[PDB]
């Protein structure tokens, strides 16, 4: 069962940098192909037969390799290059798992905002407290929830957007879902964002016994 592994899984670079990613095969094969995919669209043939560029592919891209080791290289990378690149070869069932190339930019702190459960949701017996952490960089950010002063960890779901196609920031939602009855037994709700742009968290909060 000849299998493909790709390294790195994820990498980020500023425009202008040289980029290299690798595709390794468990035994020797030839004529490796590379496919480019961006969110919400189909894979696209990018490099084929180890070194041939597909139509529309700039000469900054090159493919090379032999045996058990293949690589895709980009000179002077451009923002439009950001995508996942997958290797594959004619005898392989499962494509390589991909290298996702992301765009490095200047650090940015999130704009944070918190929302109490709506009265309409409460009527139905559930209670979601929503916190948005918008337009930040890098992707790694820590969200902490405190209810009446004690950290809370159960019932939180976080969802990050794909890197933003115009400004290269990320955004994320952090949602604390509770039963209406559990929500009604506590008062202070806090969402805290800790990001490497500051040693001090960004804090948004509300008291349920207001409004």
């Amino acid at each position: 069962d000849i299998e493909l592994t790709q390294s790195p899984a994820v990498m980020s670079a500023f425009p202008g940098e040289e980029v290299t990613m690798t595709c390794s095969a468990s035994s020797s094969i030839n004529y490796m192909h590379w496919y480019q995919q961006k969110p919400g669209t189909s894979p696209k043939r990018w490099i084929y037969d180890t070194s041939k560029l597909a139509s529309g592919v700039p000469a900054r891209f090159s493919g090379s390799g032999s045996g058990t080791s293949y690589s895709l290289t980009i000179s002077s990378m451009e923002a439009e290059d950001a995508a996942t690149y997958y290797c594959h070869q004619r005898s392989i069932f499962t494509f390589g798992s991909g290298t996702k190339l992301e765009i490095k930019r200047a650090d940015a702190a999130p704009t944070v905002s918190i929302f109490p459960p709506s009265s309409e949701q409460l009527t139905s017996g559930g209670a979601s407290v929503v916190c948005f952490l918008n337009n930040f960089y890098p992707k790694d950010i820590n969200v902490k929830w405190k209810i009446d002063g004690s950290e809370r960890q159960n019932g939180v779901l976080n969802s990050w957007t794909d890197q933003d196609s115009k400004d290269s920031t990320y955004s994320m939602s952090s949602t604390l879902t509770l039963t209406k009855d559990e929500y009604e037994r506590h008062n202070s709700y806090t969402c805290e964002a800790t990001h490497k742009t500051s040693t001090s968290p960004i804090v948004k909060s509300f008291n349920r016994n207001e409004c």
């Binding site: 192909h33 043939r45 704009t111 929302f115 109490p116 709506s118 929503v130 008291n207 207001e210």
Partner: protein
């Protein structure tokens, strides 16, 4: 010019069957080897089936195990995939692809048709307005939102003021919660414009044929 257009995907119970189709345009369909490739929820790409130009040569991926049948009708420029005894692991986006030469790169791909294998039933979303309430903001900008909860399957489409508020919008990837999907969308507008100018989220769920608008109104405290 070249077009490959898939159809036939949808929700199917485990153990069920489905037939996918791929309509081809813009090229001599019968001169080309064709394939089906699927992408799982984990973004893994798996070569499902391959068929030679004349329909007399066929290959299948390792986990197919006789449950898939690729066929083609060169007179109607259509490729098919019959799928049977479906399992949860067969949930994926199914792509029609065309082969260039005999090293078997795939030089054209269709748009994909989504197959979801589970016992869940189509369910419309609840949509809730997210106003600041007791978390009132005070800057030059204000951020509002909509919570979309409890629908199946993906996707929903969210717009704000019918697409006229397009900048300042973040619609987050949905996540499974009690085996149903939930997402939120945020919009940011000058604080001088709300509530004086109305802000409404527009939620569409095609699978359930549902369309709801939720006006974001200041809360009655």
């Amino acid at each position: 010019e070249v077009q490959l257009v898939e159809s036939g995907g949808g929700l199917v119970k485990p153990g069920g069957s489905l037939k996918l189709s791929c309509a081809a345009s813009g090229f001599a369909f019968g001169n080309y080897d064709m394939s089906w490739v699927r992408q799982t929820p984990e973004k893994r790409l798996e070569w499902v089936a391959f068929i030679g130009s004349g329909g007399g040569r066929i290959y299948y991926g390792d986990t197919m195990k006789g449950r898939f049948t690729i066929s083609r009708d060169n007179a109607k420029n259509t490729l098919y995939l019959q799928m049977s005894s479906l399992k949860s692991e067969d949930t994926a986006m199914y792509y029609c692809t065309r082969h260039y030469n005999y090293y078997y790169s795939m030089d054209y791909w269709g748009q994909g048709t989504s197959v979801i294998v589970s016992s869940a039933k189509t369910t419309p979303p609840s949509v809730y307005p997210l106003a600041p309430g007791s978390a009132a903001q005070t800057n030059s900008m204000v951020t509002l939102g909509c919570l979309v909860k409890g629908y199946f399957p993906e996707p929903v489409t969210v717009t704000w003021n019918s697409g006229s508020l397009s900048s300042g919008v973040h619609t987050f990837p949905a996540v499974l919660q009690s085996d149903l999907y939930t997402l939120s969308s945020s919009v940011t507008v000058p604080s001088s414009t709300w509530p004086s100018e109305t802000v409404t989220c527009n939620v569409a769920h095609p699978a359930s044929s549902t369309k709801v608008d939720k006006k974001i109104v200041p809360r009655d405290c």
